[PDB]
Structure formats: structure tokens, C-alpha cells
Design a protein around this nucleic acid. Sequence first.
RNA 1: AGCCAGGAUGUUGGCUUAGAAGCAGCCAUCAUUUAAAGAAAGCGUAAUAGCUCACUGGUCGAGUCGGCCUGCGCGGAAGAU
Lengths: 349, 38, 60, 141, 130
Amino acid sequence: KPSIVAKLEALHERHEEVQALLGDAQTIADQERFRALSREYAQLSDVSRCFTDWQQVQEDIETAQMMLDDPEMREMAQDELREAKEKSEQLEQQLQVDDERNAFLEVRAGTGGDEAALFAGDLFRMYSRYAEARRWRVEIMSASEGEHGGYKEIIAKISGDGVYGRLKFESGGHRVQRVPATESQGRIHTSACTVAVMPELPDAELPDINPADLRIDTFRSSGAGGQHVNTTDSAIRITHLPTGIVVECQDERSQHKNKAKALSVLGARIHAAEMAKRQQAEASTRRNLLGSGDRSDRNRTYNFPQGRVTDHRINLTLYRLDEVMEGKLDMLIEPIIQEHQADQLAALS
Amino acid sequence: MKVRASVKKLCRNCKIVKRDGVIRVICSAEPKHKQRQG
Amino acid sequence: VTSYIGGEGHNLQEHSVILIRGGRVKDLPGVRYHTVRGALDCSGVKDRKQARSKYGVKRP
Amino acid sequence: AKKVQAYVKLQVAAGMANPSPPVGPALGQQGVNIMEFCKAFNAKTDSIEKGLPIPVVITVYADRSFTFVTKTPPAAVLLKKAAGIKSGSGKPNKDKVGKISRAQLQEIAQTKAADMTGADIEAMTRSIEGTARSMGLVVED
Amino acid sequence: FRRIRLKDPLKQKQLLKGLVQLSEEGAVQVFRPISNNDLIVGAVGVLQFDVVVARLKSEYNVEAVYESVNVATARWVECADAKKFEEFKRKNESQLALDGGDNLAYIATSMVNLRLAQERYPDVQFHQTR
RNA sequence: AGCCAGGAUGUUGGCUUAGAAGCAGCCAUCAUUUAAAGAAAGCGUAAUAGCUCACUGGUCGAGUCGGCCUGCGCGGAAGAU
Ligand SMILES: [Mg+2]
Ligand SMILES: [Mg+2]
Ligand SMILES: [Mg+2]
Ligand SMILES: [Mg+2]
Ligand SMILES: [Mg+2]
Ligand SMILES: [Zn+2]
């Protein structure tokens, strides 16, 4: 706990400050601020209480050691084991606490070409094994095989309870440094892959053709029709008040046919506009989440010569790459979530 | 004053009164409850 | 034009006035000038004890 | 007696002075001093128990001076240490949270019988028992 | 306080000189928080600030706009005798500043925050210089 | 029907959330002093506080309050020489 202790110290200080801020009757006159402070106080108080208990236990551990004579092993051992247990309880309790919906996982090659495909296949196998040893379900929707090895792009759907809340930190770039299979000599090569995780969201579409927000104009058509085209209102025009689209029809001699045709065309135009809006929003979100595989923008690195996996977002290096490549990356995602939660409490101003 | 074809008592203070052949509702508590049948 | 910001860490952002001078960064295609550190709205490199005058750091 | 002037009854467990939201802003807008209850209120606290909510009165005059009187802890929290239960009801008929022995409640009724009413002790047994069936408890014979 | 921002960011000379030539005669004070880069502007009351803005707009030709900012009071902190001052200049690094005369300043955010932040860090925090 | 008076007791309840205290919503809806008083029909508070109503004593002093079968009338009811 090298850096998270600083965050918890700042959290405790802010908890004390907001505790003091509630007893002056000058910030209680307004109601929105009072309610905001009241909502802010709860989590701060709980986490601060647990952290103060941990800090006092640690300070006790620091003392009662720099002496001799008595066999101080037993009390030190019991104190440190209870400290570790309390620390584990604290981290879990402020890490858990919504958002547990299914997810879409897609990985594609970056720098490297025929070996980035192999690394993408390996990474997908890792994620699949992780999902399988969680009672989740993974099914492949789109696959583009990569000539020599794995996939140039794989898009699959993972379904379960708690999916997105744990796989939302894998979106980014993953760098691998190792000896490729497609290598005549014995050179080491650096390549990258890009991963995107996106939550599952519905597709609620409604017939927005409520006639209470439509303007209908009926008038005379223009063309060659004799003495009947003159004295008849056969042309129709519908204006949609919310969106502002206008559709005019004077195809056939019957007003009802024109009305039906123009209403259908207006509905089709509204549907197309809405679908285009959703598509562009999703495309922009995916572009920002994905990045650009260039072995220089990355979230984690895998070194096979040294067998080391490192995470640059929290600056955490570990030497258990063989377990990680076997779907045991729960020892990688938990430290991130913790650091992702202390900020959420700290971002309450 | 709501002009409607069906005037009813809406609270405990509403009273039915007929003035010049027009049935109307008046209550001392809520001024929103006064209506005229028309 | 495009200018290069040397040293470790800068406080620059949009709408900041700076002083630039000549000097070409080779492996950067299109960069042809250098930002003078210690100038109007750019501060010297923090905790720099060597070659201070090239990065506008006061002597401690 | 004097009618309500500035006082309403509300207080968390006496055990700690704990100038928390339930006690601080409850009287912070009335003025007075919040930290001062660490001595005035806690003088009677340390005798009874650590962690029992005792209701108090916060009668305060315009001179920013107060005076307080306490009562027995409410019967709802009384059947939490004598029942082994800290959660509560929510389907008091569909399910139940625990059991209470019929001989346990009345032996504690006299603690609240100072301000509880009734013709005699046996009368007050139904009052403490009638409220118990709403909590989800079951009387044990 | 009311920090400053002017429309054209290149005609910023006259606001950087018309504010060192007008804090030389006790009309305005120019803090500059350490973390970001602002030009926060002290005053003792509304009328003094009104005089400053009208004078700065008429004499020096500076078209600017003055946002508000949430700050209660500043305090000049100067205690270099010990070493704990060095760590105080780090733990509370978020809301310190630098005057025109380079004296530090604990730009508070409320009376409660200040009244707390001098209950610990038992160093001197007075409110006058020169 | 008007008019005097009461309209109480450990629910600051776990349930739920920052507070929900008769009155946001979810289950239950007993007991005590009683002549009567809902573990609440309505208004009102951020939550309290505050004001009424069901029910009950007093005055008053003789009729009073709702349905059914039916006759005739009222409103609903705005157009162009
Ligand atoms: Mg023809
Ligand atoms: Mg015709
Ligand atoms: Mg008239
Ligand atoms: Mg008729
Ligand atoms: Mg006519
Ligand atoms: Zn009415």
C-alpha cells in the first residue's frame, strides 16, 4: 500500500473537514448544500473509521519492537496477522461499494501484423478462460482469421452477473515483447493489440408517429389533370413538430393514398435519422476507447523473456506471467478497481 | 371558474347552489373548486 | 508554425503566450523551432540541478 | 408544564458524545455548543451502558442556554440486546427474524414502567408484547 | 477575489503591466496559485474592486471579463524556522499562492477550513505584510 | 344542524435511503388510560414543529337523514341575405 495510503489519508482529512463543516449553522441555512454534505458524510465516515483503526494498529506494530529480553514474537505475530485481516476486510469493503450488465469484448491486431494476430488469439484465450471459470458465457459473433495464427479481429459477447463492472478496465492497448513464431532468426520483437469493452444497452424504438404533434396540409396538385385536378385537394404534406422534417406527396389522384404514402416516408426518415445518430455516437465512443495500436500507447506490458506482466496505470509489476496467460488475471484487475474507487469518493466536490 | 356539463362537490366545504336557473358549486376553502354548469 | 517543448514536464496549455527560437528536432517531421524555457508563460524544469541556464532554473 | 417552545426529542446512543449529523446539525441551527455535550451529556452516560439510544429533551432558551432531561431507552431498541437481533421486520407476517421468551420481556418492563402507563405491571406486558409482533419477533411460551 | 481573463490572449501585455504598475500603489493585489496558472485579484471590499476595474479599463485599455471564484480569505504564512514547514508546503499544496512580492499565502476556502488548518500545523498565519 | 372542550401514552421503530417522526413508498395495524381519540381522513415542514377531521362529554330543543316505483320541467345546446 505505497500510494493508496496517501489517498486514504486525504480521504480521512476531508471526512474530518466535512464533519466540522456541519456544525456552524451558516452552511445549514441552504438545503442543497446540506443534503450534499449529508450524502458525502456516510462513505467518508465508514472508510475513515476503518482506516484509523488500521493506522493505530500499524503504529502499535511500529513500537513494541525495538527492545529485547521478553520473547515479543507472539504478540507481534498476532497483531500483524490481525492487521492483515483487517486490511483485507477494509480493501474489499471499500472496493465493492448498479452496473453489472453484459458486455461486448473485441480485440484486434495493432503493430506487428502476422504476430499481433497470434497475440490477439492468446489474449482472447486468456479472457475466455477467465470468463469460463466464473460461470459466465462467451460466444463468438465475428471472427477474421489472421492468415498464420489467430484473429485480425474477434468480437464476442460475454453474459453474466457482474460482467461489465470487472472487464471495463481492459479497454486500451496491450504490448507484448517476445520472439515471434514467424521469425527465421532469433530476434526479439515488440508488438501491440487493441482491446475494446462496451456495455450492453437496449434498442428501445417506438412509433413516433403520434398525430398530436403533426401538422397536415391539404392542397391542390400541380400538373395536367383537366377540370378535376383544379377543383380538388389531392396533394398532402406532413410536418413533424419535434424533429422538423417535412414530407409532401401528390403521386396519385386519391388523397388517402398520398396521405398513407407520405406518412410511411416520414416514419422511415425518422427511423433512419435516429439510427444514424446512434451509430455515430457508438462509433465515436469506440474510437476514443480503443486508441491506436502503436506500441507506444499502452495499458499493460507482457515480457516473455523475463516472464513479467506490468500495469502502467497503477505502476504495478509482477512476475507471474505464466499464470496470467492461463486466465488467472483476477490478480491483475483487483488492484486497479481499488484505485478506481478511492478517486470516486475523492471526487465529491 | 370551470364551465362544464357536470359539476360535483370536490371537498367537504363545497355547496350546491342554483342562481337564475344555473347550477353552480361554491366552496369557502379552495377557490379552485368553484364551477358553473354550462 | 510548430514548436518543440524541451525538458521534463511543462505547464503550457491553450491560450498561453511563449517565446520561440530556432533549432530543428531531427526525428520529428515538421518541427523546426524550440520553445525558450523560462520565458513569458513557461516555467523552468522542476528539480533541475545541471545545465540550469538552458532550462531557465534559478540557482538554489 | 409549559408547551413546546424549542425542544423535540431525538438522540443517538449515549455511549459517545459523537457530534455527528444526527446530533450536530439537529441542534447546530439552534445555536448553543455541540462539543460541550462531551461532558454535560456524558456525565449520566457512563453509568448506564455504551451503545444504547436514550431519548433526551433539548429545551433551549433565547439566551443560547439549554437544559436536558432523559428517559428510558425506547422499547424498540430494548428488544435488540435482549433478543439477539439487530436487523428488523419488513414482512412481519410472511417471515420472522427470531424468537423472544414470554418471561424475558416483563422482567425488563419495569425498567420502562417508570414512564410507561397501565393499571398495573401485568397490563403493561401487552403493550411491550403488542409492539413486539410488529417487529417480526415470535413470543416463546 | 474574482480572477481575470481577457478576450485577446496576445494583447495580454497591458494587463500584465497595468497590474504591476497599479499594485505598486496599494490598489490591488495579485495572487497566483501554484498548481494552475491564474491571475486572481484581491480586494478589501466591493468599492475598491470597482475602482480597480474601471481604472484598469480606462487608463490601460484592457477589455477583460472577471469570473467569480470561491475563496473566503487569504492569509500570509511565513514560518521557515523548522522542517515541518517543508512538508506543510506539500500536504496542503493544492491551495497556496504567490503574491506580487513573492510572499506565500494560504488562500482559504471558508472560515471553517482555515480555523481547522491552523489548529494543526502550529505555525504562524498572520494577515499583513510590509 | 350550529355553538363550548378533548382529540392522549415508550413508533428519534428496525423495514428502506442523506431525513422520512400519523401523513414518499413498501408489510403489519396490537396494546394502555378511557366518555372518547385512526398505531391516522386532510393541510403543512428538507425532517421536526404547527392547524383540522373521524369519535366522545356539554348547550339546545323538536323531528331528522337516505335509497326504490313514478308524472312534468332544467343544464349539456355554436353559422353564415
Ligand atoms: Mg392527359
Ligand atoms: Mg372535387
Ligand atoms: Mg346577474
Ligand atoms: Mg332536455
Ligand atoms: Mg340568414
Ligand atoms: Zn371545494
